[PDB]
């Protein structure tokens, strides 16, 4: 993570109203096993 300062502008607000306890990310696998790029 680089040094410096940056402010996050607001993007979205949704009235979903559901209870939230856990979350998980989503990856875009490419079939050319499988070969995928590098990310952090």
């Amino acid at each position: 993570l680089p040094q410096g300062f940056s402010a996050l502008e607001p993007l979205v607000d949704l009235p979903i109203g559901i209870n939230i306890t856990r979350f998980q990310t989503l990856l875009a696998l490419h079939r050319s096993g499988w070969t995928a790029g590098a990310a952090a």
Binding site: N19, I20, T21, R22, F23, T25, L27, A28, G37
Partner: protein, 44 residues
């Protein structure tokens, strides 16, 4: 810190009062997100 390269680590991370997410990436490997409590069809 999680690394994806095989390296396939997509665990169910806990949620709290808020979440800060950062991604150092090129060519758009990461796409979206899933939120919930039981992660199944029973709950919203």
């Amino acid at each position: 810190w999680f690394h994806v390269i095989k390296r396939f680590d997509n665990p169910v991370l806990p949620f709290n009062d808020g979440v800060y997410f950062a991604s150092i990436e090129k060519s758009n490997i990461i796409r979206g997100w899933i939120f919930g409590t039981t992660l199944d069809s029973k709950t919203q």
